[PDB]
Structure 1
């Protein structure tokens, strides 16, 4: 398959007035690792990030076109975009190429700019938006992180417990995937803080 050609795994989880997004670092070709510092999470806004998985060339292209359009929007309107508005714009961008599409599945996580209410969402390759209330996943180990999140997730979690849960899920998920790993980076989007961390994983 084409979306299994560079590997990758993205994950987002929701807490009590806080979001969390995570990814892996490995960049490789069919069966051989090249680097271990590939970026898959992009800061679209003050408290609004997007994570892309799939073909790495299309990850880069879609990130760049999206930054184009978002800069133009925030210059024309005069304020920052909302998580819901960004999701619609990305769906429109992906659906413009319905025949001959990009091979990338995005994930959005942000905070409402005035109510500070969380938001998570994922889209399919063609632009179908599904909004959830617990967590979203995307990548080659989707089933593994499904099995982890369904069991470990709780409602109304603190940032500490949210970090513990998302990290403990990503570790054990990618420990059973051949084409994912080489470390994990975790962003924690609180109200007045954005904490970043790097976990120690296995390198085989």
Structure 2
């Protein structure tokens, strides 16, 4: 598909008091890869990340546009942004191109600014929000990550088991995937600190 032009896979999983987001590293044309260091997870303020998968041009342009409107909002108002505010802003930004749509599936993962409340949501290519409690996935491969995350998720998870669960899920679903691969970046954040790890994936 058009979504399957550059590949892509973004997984977010909500833990007990923390939240973890991970994505792949491969960038390239339909079968010909180019590089292994393509960023798809972008920091939007502190303790609040976004994941983008799909067409890379829409990914970078939408990320810079959201950075634009985000900085204007946080400099009109000195407080930082709440995640629902980000979700409505992203839905508005997508729905402005109702008939001229970007080709992406944004995933928002962040914590509460006042409490430690975790948050996940994911959107469609026209701006349909959806909040859940277990996990959201996006990109070309879907059913693999759906099966793995419905297989291995528990409701109350210490950050180590959350990390290892999202690790095994991403590694197995990417190894079953063809057009997306070549290494995995993992961001696990919490109230105290932000942890970023890269896994030893199959480079086949």
Does the alignment reach a TM-score above 0.5? yes
1:105, CA displacement in angstroms? 0.4
1:56, CA displacement in angstroms? 0.4
Q: State the TM-score, normalizing by the size of structure 2.
A: 0.99
1:45, CA displacement in angstroms? 1.5
In the alignment, the residues of structure 2 paired with residue 104 and residue 140 of structure 1 have an alpha-carbon distance, to the nearest angstrom, of 10
Count of matched residue pairs: 204
1:92, CA displacement in angstroms? 0.2
1:11, CA displacement in angstroms? 0.4
Instruction: Note the residue ranges of structure 1 that are not aligned, 5 or more in a row.
Output: none
In the alignment, the residues of structure 2 paired with residue 128 and residue 5 of structure 1 have an alpha-carbon distance, to the nearest angstrom, of 22
Question: SS of the counterpart of 1:45?
Answer: coil
1:78, CA displacement in angstroms? 1.0
Question: SS of the counterpart of 2:99?
Answer: coil
In the alignment, the residues of structure 2 paired with residue 40 and residue 115 of structure 1 have an alpha-carbon distance, to the nearest angstrom, of 27
Match of 1:29 in 2: 29
Q: Please list the CA deviations of residues 74-108 of structure 1 after superposition, one character each: whole Å capped at 9, or x if unmatched.
A: 00011100011000000000000000100000000
Q: Please list the CA deviations of residues 111-140 of structure 1 after superposition, one character each: whole Å capped at 9, or x if unmatched.
A: 100011000000000000000010000011
Structure 2 matches for 1:34-183, cutoff 5 A? 34-183=34-183
In the alignment, the residues of structure 2 paired with residue 30 and residue 110 of structure 1 have an alpha-carbon distance, to the nearest angstrom, of 32
Question: SS of the counterpart of 2:52?
Answer: strand
1:29, CA displacement in angstroms? 0.2
Please provide the CA RMSD for this pair: 0.5
Question: SS of the counterpart of 1:54?
Answer: coil
In the alignment, the residues of structure 1 paired with residue 110 and residue 45 of structure 2 have an alpha-carbon distance, to the nearest angstrom, of 8
1:152, CA displacement in angstroms? 0.2
1:202, CA displacement in angstroms? 1.0
1:30, CA displacement in angstroms? 1.0
Q: By percentage of residues, which structure has more strand?
A: 1
Match of 1:5 in 2: 5
Q: Please list the CA deviations of residues 41-86 of structure 1 after superposition, one character each: whole Å capped at 9, or x if unmatched.
A: 0000110000000000100000000000000000001110001100
In the alignment, the residues of structure 2 paired with residue 71 and residue 139 of structure 1 have an alpha-carbon distance, to the nearest angstrom, of 27
Instruction: Note the residue ranges of structure 2 that are not aligned, 5 or more in a row.
Output: none
1:203, CA displacement in angstroms? 1.2
Q: State the TM-score, normalizing by the size of structure 1.
A: 0.99
